[PDB]
Amino acid sequence: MQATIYDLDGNTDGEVDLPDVFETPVRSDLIGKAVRAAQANRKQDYGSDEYAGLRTPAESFGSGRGQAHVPKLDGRARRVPQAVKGRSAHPPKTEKDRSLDLNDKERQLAVRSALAATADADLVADRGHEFDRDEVPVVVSDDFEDLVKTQEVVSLLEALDVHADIDRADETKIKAGQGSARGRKYRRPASILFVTSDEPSTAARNLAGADVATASEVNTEDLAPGGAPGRLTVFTESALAEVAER
Amino acid sequence: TSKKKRQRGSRTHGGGSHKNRRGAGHRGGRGDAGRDKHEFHNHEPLGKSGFKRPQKVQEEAATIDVREIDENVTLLAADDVAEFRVDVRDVVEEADDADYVKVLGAGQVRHELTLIADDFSEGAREKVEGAGGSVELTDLGEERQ
Amino acid sequence: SKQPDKQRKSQRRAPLHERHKQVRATLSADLREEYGQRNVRVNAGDTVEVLRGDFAGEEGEVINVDLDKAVIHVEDVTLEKTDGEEVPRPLDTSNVRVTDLDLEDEKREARLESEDDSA
């Protein structure tokens, strides 16, 4: 198909062939698998101290004093799992492999599949993104890379009737639970993904919910956050073409 | 829901009497204990058998069936097309870490072929010639006598 | 760091010279323009206006600045004890705004007026 190209003023400026990958049938299960793996792979190993609760010579008295055969020290029960201050019976272990494998072909297929979900306005809308456009993804002239001020990217997005999504992401959620005690107090909706070619857009990155990537390494996660396909994206002239051979 | 997830409240988690799942006695001994006594069943029998020759006095032939060669003649365009002429050595994978290449005669040969290899099987020849073809024994192949 | 425990920790355990920044307050529009800064370290000479608590709206002279507890006392911003005596109600500088500086110290003034640095 063909995709319309836009200049920094938001005006049309020709158009190009939308590469074939964007016609890859959408496979949400393969995409979900890909995201699930990337998420598991950055998780850190953990586990309780292997000697926790074992630093004691506590011994059981056995039968005779009308007492349960429980290891005790200084009249205190210890070591065993049912004992307060005792060891953890089956605790998290450092040796556990918390990574997930994924064949390269299966992963690459998912990237292509996620790329393709980006060109389906109905899907993009279902995913949740707020926009008032018909063509998707949004293709823009390579000059986009030369921008510097965030507000300039704002004007362009407003001109492109795509700024509504940023307003959507301009609301953080203060999570329920103890994540807060560990630095995970906030979370927020995912908005527009800017895919450039030379370097990620420093001008767009700070936008609420925004994500920036480069055609050479954009992955399943930026294309489909949380494994949900159809992210409202904005490619760069060259980014669009370079992404064709992924 | 998995089986594991359904065991809470069951008490014995599928073990039957709670006197069953204890130590190695419940397995009749650890590892292959009793492989000649209480658990001889389906176990390989005891004993020695044969011998082994030293690994550096052993030859490993790289083999291929005419069927493989013949089925890919056209595809193997990057290889001679005479009155096809094919040096099996340039065809067999793993033909490097092998001491020699041998052509076996499994399948059919629907073309006339001139095969060059370190050795062939009786049937490999009968078939190749039978389809108006020839067989050329390599120089290395000159170890038959 | 990004971890809440460490963030609070570094603040509660900061050495004295690093606590000056815990008693800084935003400058009035004029002063901001005048010294090219958005805020300053509140001194026991400055005049300030309360913009938040129960004393929001009042202005007064800073009578004391406690670095140990990172708080300030402002003239007339007080509480009445049971015996009747009047005592100061400590304020977080974050709820106040400096409307007039005490530049009796050449160093502070020099610091404020310098451009490469702030006071």
Place this chain on the structure above:
Amino acid sequence: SKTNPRLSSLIADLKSAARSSGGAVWGDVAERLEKPRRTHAEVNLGRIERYAQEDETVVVPGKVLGSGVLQKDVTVAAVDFSGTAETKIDQVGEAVSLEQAIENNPEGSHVRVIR
């Protein structure tokens, strides 16, 4: 509990066709695709060459692979083809998806099942 959404749609389309048209193969192939993957067909070209005949659509309730030689000019309809399979077949005949086959022949007539 199939996981591939496309496989699910195919199965749904296969049933719609078998119920609405005079075609029992489609409902048959559907019943087989509903079975576990391990039972799905994995057919090499050599087998299609041995039992297929022209003007009779070959239907594979599985996937077609590239071993062997196909010379007969036949139309093969499968759940999927390996890159090579689809290549060899297209040379002497034609490779088609069950989704296409179902559309060109809802009645599912003149067709031979191969596994």
Place this chain on the structure above:
RNA sequence: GCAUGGCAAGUCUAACCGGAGUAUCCGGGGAGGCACAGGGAAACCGACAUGGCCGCAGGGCUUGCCCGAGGGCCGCCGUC
């Protein structure tokens, strides 16, 4: 073993290298493994891309009669 998914006469990379948004991730790396031939202690030799008959599903026809993948019973082939 099984269920699901990729790829398929192949399949997968390991350590590790480059890139980067720097533990994630993108590209590279096929060393090596398993599969693609077996039998024999070894020396050593080396196989059905189908020859016959039943027949389920399915297809065809002029509605009992054909074609009949898979399957079943045999031939035959490699080797000790």
Place this chain on the structure above:
RNA sequence: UAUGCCAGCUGGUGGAUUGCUCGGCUCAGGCGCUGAUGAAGGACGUGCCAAGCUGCGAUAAGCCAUGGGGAGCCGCACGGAGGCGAAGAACCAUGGAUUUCCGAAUGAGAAUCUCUAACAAUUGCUUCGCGCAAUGAGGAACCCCGAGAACUGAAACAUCUCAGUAUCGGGAGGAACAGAAAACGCAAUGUGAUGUCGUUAGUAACCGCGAGUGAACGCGAUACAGCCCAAACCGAAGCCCUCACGGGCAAUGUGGUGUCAGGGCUACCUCUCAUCAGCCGACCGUCUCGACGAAGUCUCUUGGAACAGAGCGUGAUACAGGGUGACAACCCCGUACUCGAGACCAGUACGACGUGCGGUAGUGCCAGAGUAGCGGGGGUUGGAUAUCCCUCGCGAAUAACGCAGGCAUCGACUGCGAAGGCUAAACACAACCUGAGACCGAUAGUGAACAAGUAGUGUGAACGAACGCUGCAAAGUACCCUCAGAAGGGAGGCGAAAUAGAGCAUGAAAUCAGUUGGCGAUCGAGCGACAGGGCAUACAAGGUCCCUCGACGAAUGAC
């Protein structure tokens, strides 16, 4: 109706629950030796008031210098009094001063003190004098060299296993160890020091041929680096101490040459950029620390408080995280960007100084002995005839010689020179620094969020808890009454709240006091389930139910 049963209400007791996190746990990166110049550790001191912790050392929570920093300060610790600071204090970085006693502990002795100048003891050098030096002890583990179990598995058990594990002795470093072939043996016209990682592979090998044990060559990677002696031929041409004088060492050989691209020597060609020694000396990168740093504290409403809702507005290379009286990019610290310094890389890389690579011909001049090798006995190993080592005995050749290529001998072939030595980098650990987290969230997580190795137990080795939360602000309750009363009580004051008033957020159950409903001093025990009656019931969150009659009317079914 007493004693009393069941349920609830008000108030306790208790500290569950919810929320909170100054502590843990684990991972990652960086970094990494200290001590006779007396360490690490301990004891005892040291403050205006000072018990504990922290700091410090008779100059005792500190003294001095330089830079930073800044109007405050006098640690944890929110008191009282007093003092210090523009003579620029506090605080921070770097460097310096002081630094009691015991402690390797070293003049001798000793439970931290005492007695009459001290490297005690063992060594090297030696001016033969403790004159100059070394050693000793510490360190989380990691590392190297020695000593070396058993429970256990084999369903018993002895070989075997657990395991060269636990534990013990000795010793080094920031990393250790190894290391430039008497190699390999994909046998080759081939590879080319050594670790390590992936693989080779649970393969070869071992084994009551049981259970079990278990490599290597190679290959892909990481990192790369190669040299020095002994002797031959020379023969004092030399080295160490001292400013010097001078002394000491050295013919039992200092020094030159040389080191398998064998060397030396005699005779030649050519030439050096090899090597070795020394000089100089980074970039970059990584880690940490630091400077700078945009934009609202606008309106109304609610509230004790706006960081809430509604309205208006703004920055962003900054929408990480935290703080601030409630959900904060724009109130404060920070964060992005940019910049600075230290540390590590590394005295390395580069560069430069000197030295001089190599080739021909001749020469049986030189080339590491209890060795190579064999036998007896042990251990160990996958090592099987074919692992490595110990022990007793025996014991060679001299490059024209010798060793190896998985049984022995002999020949051939291929490889390689043992019995002298050094060697960067790539790898292990985590004390220390920093960062991180689908980890735990106060009976959890460390034994330890608190006085934590604390209180406490044991003659000793050693053993070892529990204790988190007022409030926005102490505004931490003035005055009065009562009382033996700084108690407690009453009244009162503060605050949104005292049912927030001190183990002071919330405040379960067990259970206690008082009390409400139901039952109750002639009656019977798994305490109930299901039916049905009594009595009891504020609202809200349920709104149905009863009687006459009529309609419908299954099985069944009359007088």
